[PDB]
Design a binder for this molecule. Structure first.
Ligand code: FMN
Length: 367
């Protein structure tokens, strides 16, 4: 229970992990011109541990998938070559690392689109003015009205994910994670609060689940189920991505993942779910527990977790692995600190998205 169950080995498919502290995917914006830089190597290397699992920042799968400044891409030979150098360093420390494939959908701006073209999505409806997009100059902009793509273009996006999954393997990545959460492209098809389509990709839970099912299946056939992880957030309403029945949508997603595993005769690397964060917390815990019970495979929880909460989650059987975002930013050796239960450093939100390759990136001290 308290003898820290976070440090007991765990089998994640063909990957033998030595502990359960996981680095959650986090956009840091240091990949100048969407090209991984040596700094990304320093940062990850700094946080990697023998047998530890790392999940990279969201990564572009095409020239139209970005919505943040200087986020890494993995759709060009140049990008793969730079990633490979980063993965080698990470692998040298004995860690496992998956590349998160990320497409922002409508959460973008003309400034992030080639030829200033408009962002794509499942709908033509934009994000409310309740949300402002971070601009390259450091200010905030207004999310534009997106272009509702047809069925044909949808299949092309599916191919972009598939090809990026291959490039990831080519770069040496142990696997990839499908970013299907936080209101981005895939979540824009999942959430009935956004998906207003009348074709076979909209309406019922089934149709709304079609896109992510085709994406996961596509990458599964490309690099093998055991090297694919999926992240979703049924109960996160970030960027107007809400659903009338969060838990139902999540179960529907879980059912599809269970079938894909069955049909592929192999299990996914894991299901990764983000929690919202008292009756609210007791309600969220149930939701999280239910999704976990429903999914036949490794479950990774995320969202405001602490050393105490992580220890509890694994002990109570609510999860097999616990990812940490913010605390991992200011604590390179977070794994080590959670082990010794040492004080943690504070994080500086101000330097979460700046471009400096050191300040607020790799200059947070070790114990
Ligand atoms: C600066 C920053 C960047 C993030 N970038 C991503 C991302 O690219 N993809 C993603 O799925 N989640 C992203 N997240 C969400 C985190 O992965 C994670 O779910 C969150 O940090 C969990 O809560 P915690 O900070 O209490 O650990 C980001 C969070 C922060 C603070």
């Amino acid at each position: 229970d308290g003898n820290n169950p976070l440090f007991s080995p765990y089998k994640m498919g063909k990957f033998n992990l030595s502990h359960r502290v996981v680095l959650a995917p986090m956009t840091r914006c240091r990949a100048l011109n969407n090209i991984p830089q040596a700094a990304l190597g320093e940062y990850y290397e700094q946080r990697a541990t023998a047998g530890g699992f790392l999940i990279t920042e969201g990564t572009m799968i095409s020239p139209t998938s970005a919505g943040y400044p200087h986020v890494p891409g993995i759709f060009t030979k140049e990008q793969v070559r730079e990633w490979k150098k980063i993965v080698d360093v990470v692998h040298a420390k004995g860690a496992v690392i998956f590349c998160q494939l990320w497409h922002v959908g409508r959460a973008s701006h003309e400034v992030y689109q080639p030829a200033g073209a408009a962002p794509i999505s499942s709908t033509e409806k934009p994000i409310s003015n309740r949300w402002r997009i971070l601009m390259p100059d450091g200010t905030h902009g207004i999310y534009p009205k997106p272009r509702a793509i047809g069925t044909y273009e949808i299949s092309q996006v599916v191919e972009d994910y598939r090809r990026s999954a291959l490039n990831a393997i080519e770069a040496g990545f142990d696997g990839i994670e499908i970013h299907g959460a936080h209101g981005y492209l895939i979540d824009q098809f999942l959430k009935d609060g956004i998906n207003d389509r009348t074709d076979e990709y909209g309406g019922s839970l089934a149709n709304r689940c079609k896109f992510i099912t085709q994406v996961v299946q596509a990458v599964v056939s490309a690099i093998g189920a055991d090297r694919v992880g999926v992240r979703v957030s049924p109960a996160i309403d970030y960027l107007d991505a809400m659903d009338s029945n969060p838990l139902s949508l999540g179960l529907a997603v879980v059912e599809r993942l269970n079938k894909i595993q069955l049909h592929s005769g192999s299990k996914l690397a894991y299901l990764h779910v983000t929690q919202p964060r008292l009756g609210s917390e007791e309600e969220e815990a149930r939701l999280m527990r239910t999704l976990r019970n429903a999914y036949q495979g490794t479950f990774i929880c995320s969202g405001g977790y602490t050393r105490e909460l992580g220890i509890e989650a694994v002990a109570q059987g609510d999860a097999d692995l616990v990812s940490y975002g913010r605390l991992f930013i200011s604590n390179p050796d977070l794994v080590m600190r959670i082990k010794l239960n040492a004080p943690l450093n504070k994080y500086n939100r101000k330097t979460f998205y700046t471009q400096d390759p050191v300040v607020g990136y790799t200059d947070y001290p070790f114990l």
